[PDB]
Design a protein around this ligand. Structure first.
Ligand SMILES: *[C@@H]1O[C@H](CO)[C@@H](O[C@@H]2O[C@H](CO)[C@@H](O)[C@H](O)[C@H]2NC(C)=O)[C@H](O)[C@H]1NC(C)=O
Ligand code: NAG
Ligand code: NAG
Ligand code: NAG
Ligand code: NAG
Lengths: 165, 91, 54, 165, 165
């Protein structure tokens, strides 16, 4: 979406930060969002199809000779079951893939919004998914942003001065 | 000098654990059961014309077994056949 | 045993209410009955995510 | 999410406001969003499973003796139907619960955004789902916010002065 | 939602802009979002139900006389298949309609947010889905907004002066 590009250099996690300040460019991964998405994905098929059911004695499904009515009925029953289960599989896979994609997009958006809310007035969204912060933000500042304990109040004056002159 | 306005949603002390696409068990405020797993143990005689076959099988009532003589010309919406039905005529 | 009562769905286990869409009593049914499923319970959420205090 | 806690003291509705100003803390519920969610939830099963279908004469499903092919076929048909309907029930309940949860989250977010749009520049989102309004906002002001007729223009100067000094 | 009204005068696309500035009111459609939604909708049924399966020889489904067990079994099999397929059709149509509606709402919101991010500080969201831009924005400006290359930096000073006086 507004990220426009993935990071093949990101191997630490699924979603993460790339920061650039006076000290220098650094990169880290956000473990909580990646872990949440993986946890929500790790099952996703045992929660609907609990397991393989256990079938022991069934009808005959292959015939040598030609009987008539009963063989036709058996063939019809097997064909109906096969078609219905194929439709169930197709629909289930399509729905799960669509929901998984929407879920990961929502997780990315949630991480972006959480970061934006940490930087209340100290940063501006440049629109390409990357924040321009309007004050001195060192590596401790950046890891506090990543930590979730960024104190926006103590940079409010400097940030507002940088923004509105 | 300034006001404050918080937003929130109602919660409950205890919640019900349901199952979703992405969770085996997730807690919600309320949930209804969808599977009827209990029965009253008795057959309601309306709106369906029930015919209790006391000691009589369907074929025994059909043929005219003496202890089934009461079932002549009967009609039913559901014929209920008891396990205690027996035959008492020519084998 | 037969009873003097109103019910649209009859199983060998007796009459059952047909307000719910599924039942786990018996696969033999008569009338406007719910469908038989192998699960004894399926809870449908009728509220929001529950996050209590503390 | 960003609310982080529900209100067990809220019995008036599902979503509502808790305000605190000079006069004192007050609480009310928003009826429109709660009613909308309840209305969208009130059905939600008659709209897919219209009703219980009505079956009068069927096959035998319990057997005393052992016949062979035909009894096997009857058992197979009943088992296939039971398994398919169990899967349908499981999938339907899972999908409806997931969609209901997403729906209620979206309704909460919509109420929050509607309130934020009423308070154009007069308030700032503190990030915990609670607005700090930067002007005199009395109980009439608060009930106008809750009403949806909050006039942001007449507090714009005072709010901007409180914000940017 | 926050648009509150559709535009029956819009025939160019599904989503679009209506601008009003000193020059005069103009209207255009955004082709990318409309095309994306149409592309995602154009299939949406071949991707689950690939095609109509091909059935050649089946059981008898209409009977003249009364046989007994076997005719009952055939009737039961056909009725079970018909009921299951009716449920599949009903559920599929309901789910696809719900997801399509959510998809179009999300596309509208995405277009709105993209426009808002183009106008970083130069415009204010009036809350009815319509932006008040706080600087001279001529037809070239508007078509740059619609284009996606709006340069917010060169109007930043004038916009901030109009906003905060
Ligand atoms: C969850 O929803 C159900 C359905 O409305 C509630 O159960 C009903 O509550 C009303 C309230 O007066 C009673 O009249 C009904 O008899 C209840 N139905 C049953 C089957 O008991 C239930 O109270 C709700 N629970 C919560 C926590 O919201
Ligand atoms: C991050 O924050 C947590 C809790 O606020 C703290 O315990 C930790 O020391 C911080 N720094 C890290 C994890 O590097
Ligand atoms: C309610 O909550 C209590 C404690 O949280 C729990 O013990 C109980 O099982 C819950 N349900 C009812 C019906 O009390
Ligand atoms: C809320 O607004 C409506 C319409 O704007 C008005 O009729 C009503 O008097 C207001 N106050 C309330 C409902 O207390
Ligand atoms: C819109 O932008 C594109 C690429 O930035 C450019 O090629 C084109 O000339 C612009 N104007 C249009 C399409 O009217």
């Amino acid at each position: 979406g507004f990220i426009e590009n993935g990071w093949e250099g990101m191997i630490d996690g699924w979603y993460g930060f790339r920061h650039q300040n006076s000290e220098g460019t650094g990169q880290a991964a956000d473990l909580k969002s990646t872990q949440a998405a993986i946890d929500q994905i790790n099952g996703k098929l045992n929660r609907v199809i609990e397991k393989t059911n256990e079938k022991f004695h069934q009808i005959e499904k292959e015939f040598s000779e030609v009987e008539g009515r009963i063989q036709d009925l058996e063939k019809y029953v097997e064909d109906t079951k096969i078609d219905l289960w194929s439709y169930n599989a197709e629909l289930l896979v399509a729905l799960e893939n669509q929901h998984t994609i929407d879920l990961t997009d929502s997780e990315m958006n949630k991480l972006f919004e959480k970061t934006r809310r940490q930087l209340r007035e100290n940063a501006e969204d440049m629109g390409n998914g990357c924040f321009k912060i309007y004050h001195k933000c060192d590596n401790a500042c950046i890891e506090s942003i990543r930590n979730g304990t960024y104190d926006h109040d103590v940079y409010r004056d400097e940030a507002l001065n940088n923004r509105f002159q | 000098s300034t006001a404050t306005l918080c937003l929130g949603h109602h919660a409950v002390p205890n919640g019900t654990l349901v199952k979703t696409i992405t969770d085996d068990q997730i807690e919600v405020t309320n949930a209804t059961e969808l599977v009827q797993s209990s029965s009253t143990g008795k057959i309601c005689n309306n709106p369906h014309r029930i015919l209790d076959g006391i000691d009589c099988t369907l074929i025994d009532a059909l043929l005219g077994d003496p202890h089934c003589d009461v079932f002549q010309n009967e009609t039913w919406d559901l014929f209920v056949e008891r396990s205690k039905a027996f035959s008492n005529c020519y084998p | 045993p037969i009873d003097t009562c109103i019910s649209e769905c009859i199983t060998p286990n007796g009459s059952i209410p047909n307000d719910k869409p599924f039942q786990n009593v018996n696969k033999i049914t008569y009338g406007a009955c719910p469908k038989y499923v192998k699960q004894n319970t399926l809870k449908l959420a009728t509220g929001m995510r529950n996050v209590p205090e503390k």
